[PDB]
Amino acid sequence: RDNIQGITKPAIRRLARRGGVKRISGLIYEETRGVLKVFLENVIRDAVTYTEHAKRKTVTAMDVVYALKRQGRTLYGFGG
Amino acid sequence: RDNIQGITKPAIRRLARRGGVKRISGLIYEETRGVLKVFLENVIRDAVTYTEHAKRKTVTAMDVVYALKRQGRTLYGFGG
Amino acid sequence: ARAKAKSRSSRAGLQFPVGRVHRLLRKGNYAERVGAGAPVYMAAVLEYLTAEILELAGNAARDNKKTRIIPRHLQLAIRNDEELNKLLGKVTIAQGGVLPNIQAVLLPKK
Amino acid sequence: KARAKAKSRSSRAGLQFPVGRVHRLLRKGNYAERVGAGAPVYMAAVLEYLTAEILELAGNAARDNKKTRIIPRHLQLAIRNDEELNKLLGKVTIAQGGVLPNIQAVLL
Amino acid sequence: RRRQGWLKEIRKLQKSTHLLIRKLPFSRLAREICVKFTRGVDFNWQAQALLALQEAAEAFLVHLFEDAYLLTLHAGRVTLFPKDVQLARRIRGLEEGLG
Amino acid sequence: RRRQGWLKEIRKLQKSTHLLIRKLPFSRLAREICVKFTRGVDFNWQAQALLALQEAAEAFLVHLFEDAYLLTLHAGRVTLFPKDVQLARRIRGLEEGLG
Amino acid sequence: KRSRKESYSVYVYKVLKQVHPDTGISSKAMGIMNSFVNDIFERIAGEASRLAHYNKRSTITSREIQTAVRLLLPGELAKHAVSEGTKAVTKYTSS
Amino acid sequence: RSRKESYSVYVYKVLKQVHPDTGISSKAMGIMNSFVNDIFERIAGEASRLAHYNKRSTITSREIQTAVRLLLPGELAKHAVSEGTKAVTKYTSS
DNA sequence: ATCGATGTATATATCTGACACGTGCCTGGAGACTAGGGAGTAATCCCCTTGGCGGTTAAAACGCGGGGGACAGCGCGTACGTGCGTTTAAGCGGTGCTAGAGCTGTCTACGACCAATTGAGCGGCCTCGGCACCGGGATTCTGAT
DNA sequence: ATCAGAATCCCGGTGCCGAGGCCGCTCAATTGGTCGTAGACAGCTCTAGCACCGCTTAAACGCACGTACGCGCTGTCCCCCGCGTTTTAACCGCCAAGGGGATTACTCCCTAGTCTCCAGGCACGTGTCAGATATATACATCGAT
């Protein structure tokens, strides 16, 4: 069982039901997992770069909030 | 002759021919004039405030390029 | 020997602390000098923005029969009002679901 | 006399971009309280690399047009024909520039 | 015997780089818009600023028309409709569409 | 005995506030993505960082799915296809959509 | 020992208990308000700093913050903010 | 009077090194000049935010290094890091 | 089911204005030296993250059957490109005028900075209530009856 | 036309843990002088932006018309959802260990700052060639027969 297979198909359908989607194609799962992988790849790359500059070895919440702040999607609720 | 018709039908047709549009509905002219008008209001308000801060009365190229920079569409070739 | 120490906020009559905003502007390297009225103006703008979001949040919480603000009400309050939404469209809200809505063609019968 | 002959710091780096002008702009830029010594040299290397690569793409784009003088059309064609630069310079609009010669796939 | 002649026009405009709207309608439209925000005072304009405004506006409208044409092609249509440009403006960035 | 029940599900899930994807697969996915950049050194994670990552990723995916739903609705279908979500990722641009 | 770790929480308490007497707030919403006020602070301060640098002045005075707040928030929100700022400096310059 | 400093001459020299016989018009030189100022302002913004986030007061070469790694995508940044290393290894001598 | 008219691409002549190069200059970069504090590094504490184990249970997975909807195709009407003749307004030159942009010189209000003081605000701790959950009764849609 | 059943919503009752109040403290905000320079301001000089006008011509415009294409409709078949059953991994609680985050002390090197000197880059000319346009030639491409 690969590591992207932890993203289950009822969960992706739950994301679609939040989005107002009535029906879901059987082919959507691979591309949705792919877009999740590329998005998380770019964000985790940004946050781990911020960690490596500070000479720390642990991604704290501040690194995730700054890394998302530099991609144009700032998140509120975890400190400033 | 009202001034919004100075942006002519062949000019918008040429803009669509640059965009790859092969066939053009006749109702598109009023809506395209609408989006052009909203865009011009958005940029001109910010550039006029940038002129108003310097206690000047002439819109220079630096203030219009800064106003385009604050909307997230930077423009090259007219100063920094 | 000297006069009684008054906060500068009481000179402005405002609730956001001008002294802390002045300390943040001095160590923030924005400019080499800081004018005297600029942190007062900042305190006013922040006071009004907090008052706007809290007023919409309190009405949004009272609409859900609740007397204590959870982030769900803050999200709903921000996104219903267009003017704040334009400012806050670019910001994700934690613990925040999307507005209760559905596109009109999906509702088949009335 | 006792004062040595002046070497520019760009000549110490073997680079063309002006190190001293960048040091003055970092001092008046006010991004940081203090300015470290090796940081404008590192930045200057980064700009030399960017200008050299973009000018190389511009020169090849000029050779495709059989011209030897660079027009903004050459920069526009050089910039969007490179995907890593397309991610870099997607958001900038280039003055005196056209669009790519891209006709959509329903040509028949 | 005319079959299709738009192809010469589209490739000729995508290989030319000149400006597409005449300078004077854009000029008087810009001055009529500018007097509406500065409370009736008349402003002067540098020529390079007005030229830069026309370059930015024309590039933005060209990109918006490519976006709406991808929306036409996705729904099975071939002619550009106003609902397509409306949906393109909504699906674009909320900040970018209207400030 | 079979009735359609998507309407109660959509009405119930759009008023929810808890995180909707399972937490632990998301956690090991973030760790297995993280190990590809620090050259095999095991990094530690605070819990609040993974919680913030889940919040940002889930809101972004919901925005992407509604906009691609506008695309699928536009074609007269009601089912969301992979060509629509790919087209919406192209139309959001290079900085917000691909990355 | 621990550091002070300053924040904006108590002012959200005072403005909340002034605008609404009987309404409470959770700690996660308090943190979300804290990050919100820090973010909008950084945008307004970055706007005033860039604009002061563009016109070759070196001081941030109230005029630069005025043009910045009119420039960044969209519409009549900024208009009311200009009104409150003028009223605030009207009170502040008295003493 | 006014000096109006521009990077025109440095763009001309690097152009002369990479392509010997290629010229440049004034509008494309202005395009290059505003381009260099723009990439400068982005890198300075990354150095300012990272110096303030980690409670450091000075930008050293490490800050610019992680900033250029963060802002430019992919292998272009890596080769820029290579260029910076070859710059610093010759700067510290003599 | 091949050949001819013409749109389309390219070579040649012949200039102009912009371009690349030369020159004087001034101000900004460089050299040398000093002072002071930012930060590098080592040591230590504890915390909180990771790792592990056992059981639970709701969720995932899988299969099956039914029907809503995607898709290809056909006819109709409408609206759009193209061609041709008319107009009109944009652009270009040419002059002229003056508001306002830019620089220079003076001065003062305003803001940086330091030391003593004190209270506003922050960490820690405690209590009770808004809220989370469950159960019973009125309300509401479906689709058989 | 008409309601049993399931579902939904509302309301009463219970319990708990996080919010809000309280107290000690410490360092940051405030006050009071002091000193220096950014900018406000007055004034003067001059470019360039606006206004006007003639003239030409390319571009805009209106209409007629044939036809490409949007759209409603229909049939077919396919693939997705609801439901039921079996399996499994997330989850919760507990616990231990140790890597590492966080803090403090100590030290020293790097950089702000000052002063002098000189050369790189910028304003201003200037001579000359790449690009623009016109013209001639041929290739390809569509149309005719």
Q: Give the angle E83-D101-E54 at the CA atoms, nearest 5°.
A: 65
Of D40, D54, D5, D8, the closest CA to residue H87 belongs to D40
Of G47, G55, G72, the CB nearest to B54: G55
Contacts of H63 in chain A (CB under 8 A): 53
| Under 8 Å between Cβ of A18 and F13 | yes
Residues 6+ apart with CB under 8 A from G44: C42, C45, G65, G68, G69, G72
Q: In terms of DSSP H, where are the helices of D16-91?
A: 19-29, 39-64, 72-80, 83-88
Instruction: State both tokens at H69.
Output: 């790694």
Give the single-character DSSP code of B3.
G
Nearest nucleotide to F22, CA against C1' atoms: J90
How far away is chain F from the Cα of C54, in angstroms, using its nearest Cα?
20
- Asked if the C-beta of A79 comes within 8 angstroms of chain G's C-beta atoms, the answer is yes
Q: Is D18 left (phi over 0), alpha (psi -120 to 50) or beta?
A: beta
- Asked if the C-beta of F94 comes within 8 angstroms of chain D's C-beta atoms, the answer is yes
Give the single-character DSSP code of B62.
H
- Asked if the C-beta of B20 comes within 8 angstroms of chain D's C-beta atoms, the answer is yes
Q: How many domains does chain A have?
A: 1
Domain hosting residue D70, numbered range: 1-108
Of D10, D29, D30, the closest CA to residue D20 belongs to D10
Other CB atoms within a 10 A radius of the CB of residue B42 amount to 17
Q: Which chains touch H (3 or more CB pairs under 8 A)?
A: A, B, C, D
| Under 8 Å between Cβ of E98 and E86 | no
How far apart CA A15 and CA A18 sit, in angstroms, is 5
| Under 8 Å between Cβ of D62 and D78 | no
How far apart CA D24 and CA D19 sit, in angstroms, is 9
Domain hosting residue A50, numbered range: 1-80
| Under 8 Å between Cβ of C91 and A75 | yes
Q: How far is CA D22 from CA D29, D30, H47, H48, H59, in A?
A: 10, 13, 14, 15, 14
How far apart CA F28 and CA E85 sit, in angstroms, is 42
Identity of residue H9? V
CATH at residue G61: 1.10.20.10
Q: How many domains does chain C have?
A: 1
How far away is chain B from the Cα of D105, in angstroms, using its nearest Cα?
10
| Under 8 Å between Cβ of B13 and B42 | no
Q: How many domains does chain G have?
A: 1
How far apart CA C21 and CA C43 sit, in angstroms, is 8
- Per-residue DSSP letters for chain A? --GGGGS-HHHHHHHHHHTT-SEE-TTHHHHHHHHHHHHHHHHHHHHHHHHHHTT-SEE-HHHHHHHHHTTT-EEESS--
Secondary-structure breakdown of chain D: helix, strand, coil percentages, each rounded to the nearest 5: 55, 5, 40
Contact between the CB of D69 and strand I at under 7 Å: yes
Of F22, C89, D81, the closest CA to residue D90 belongs to D81
How far apart CA F44 and CA H46 sit, in angstroms, is 25
- What determination technique applies here? cryo-EM
Give the single-character DSSP code of G14.
H
Residues 6+ apart with CB under 8 A from F63: none
- Asked if the C-beta of C70 comes within 8 angstroms of chain F's C-beta atoms, the answer is yes
Other CB atoms within a 10 A radius of the CB of residue B19 amount to 22
- Per-residue DSSP letters for F37-70? TTTT---EE-HHHHHHHHHHHHHHHHHHHHHHHH
Domains within chain F, CATH numbers bracketed: 1-99 (1.10.20.10)
Contact between the CB of G22 and strand I at under 7 Å: no
| Under 8 Å between Cβ of G43 and C104 | no
How far away is chain D from the Cα of H15, in angstroms, using its nearest Cα?
7
Of F96, E34, C9, F47, the closest CA to residue B49 belongs to E34
3-state secondary structure of E42: coil
- Per-residue DSSP letters for chain H? ------SHHHHHHHHHHH-TT-EE-HHHHHHHHHHHHHHHHHHHHHHHHHHHHTT--EE-HHHHHHHHHHHS-THHHHHHHHHHHHHHHHHS--
| Under 8 Å between Cβ of C77 and C53 | yes
How far apart CA F59 and CA B7 sit, in angstroms, is 41
3-state secondary structure of C5: coil
- What does DSSP say about strands B75-76 and D93-94: parallel, antiparallel, or unpaired? parallel
Of F15, F56, F69, the CB nearest to C92: F56
How far apart CA F89 and CA A35 sit, in angstroms, is 9
How far apart CA E22 and CA B8 sit, in angstroms, is 9
Do B and D make contact via 3 or more CB pairs under 8 A? The reply is yes
- Per-residue DSSP letters for B4-59? GGGS-HHHHHHHHHHTT--EE-TTHHHHHHHHHHHHHHHHHHHHHHHHHHTT-SEE
Q: How far is the CA of H48 from the C1' of I37 (A)?
A: 21
Q: Within 37-76 of chain B, which residues have Cβ less than 7 Å from strand I?
A: 56-58, 60
3-state secondary structure of F96: helix
Other CB atoms within a 10 A radius of the CB of residue A33 amount to 17
Instruction: State both tokens at C68.
Output: 């204590």
Other CB atoms within a 10 A radius of the CB of residue F96 amount to 17
State the sign of the Cα–Cα–Cα–Cα dihedral H40, C87, G11, G89. Answer: positive
How far apart CA F54 and CA C103 sit, in angstroms, is 26
Instruction: State both tokens at B37.
Output: 């008008």
Length of chain C, in residues: 110
- Asked if the C-beta of F85 comes within 8 angstroms of chain E's C-beta atoms, the answer is no
| Under 8 Å between Cβ of E55 and E93 | no
- What does DSSP say about strands F79-80 and A23-24: parallel, antiparallel, or unpaired? parallel
3-state secondary structure of C88: helix
Q: Give the angle E94-E30-E60 at the CA atoms, nearest 5°.
A: 40
How far apart CA G38 and CA A69 sit, in angstroms, is 13
Instruction: State both tokens at E48.
Output: 């390079």
How far apart CA D108 and CA C42 sit, in angstroms, is 61
How far apart CA E71 and CA F88 sit, in angstroms, is 9
Instruction: Considering only the C-alpha atoms of chain E, give the largest distance between any 2 of them, rounded to a whole number of Å.
Output: 57
| Radius of gyration in angstroms for the set of CA atoms belonging to chain D, rounded to a whole number | 20
Q: In terms of DSSP H, where are the helices of chain E?
A: 6-15, 23-35, 47-74, 82-91, 94-97
Contacts of F95 in chain D (CB under 8 A): 87, 90-91
CATH at residue D39: 1.10.20.10
Q: What are phi and psi of D70, to 5 degrees?
A: -85, 125
- Per-residue DSSP letters for C49-77? HHHHHHHHHHHHHHHTT-SEE-HHHHHHH
Contact between the CB of G14 and strand I at under 7 Å: no
Q: Which helix (H) or strand (E) holds E44?
A: strand E44-45
Q: What are phi and psi of F32, to 5 degrees?
A: -75, -25
Instruction: State both tokens at E68.
Output: 């709406």
How far apart CA D61 and CA D71 sit, in angstroms, is 10
> How many CA atoms within 13 Å lie on the side-chain side of F71?
30
- Scan for tokens 């008295």, then name that residue: G94
- Asked if the C-beta of C91 comes within 8 angstroms of chain F's C-beta atoms, the answer is no
Q: What are phi and psi of G60, to 5 degrees?
A: -90, 110
Other CB atoms within a 10 A radius of the CB of residue H43 amount to 21
Of A70, F32, B17, D105, the closest CA to residue H46 belongs to A70
Q: Give the angle B70-B74-B78 at the CA atoms, nearest 5°.
A: 115
Strand-pairing partners, residue F80, are: A24
Identity of residue D2? A
How far apart CA G12 and CA C54 sit, in angstroms, is 9
Residues 6+ apart with CB under 8 A from H49: A66, A70
State the sign of the Cα–Cα–Cα–Cα dihedral D2, D5, D8, D9. Answer: negative
Other CB atoms within a 10 A radius of the CB of residue F41 amount to 9
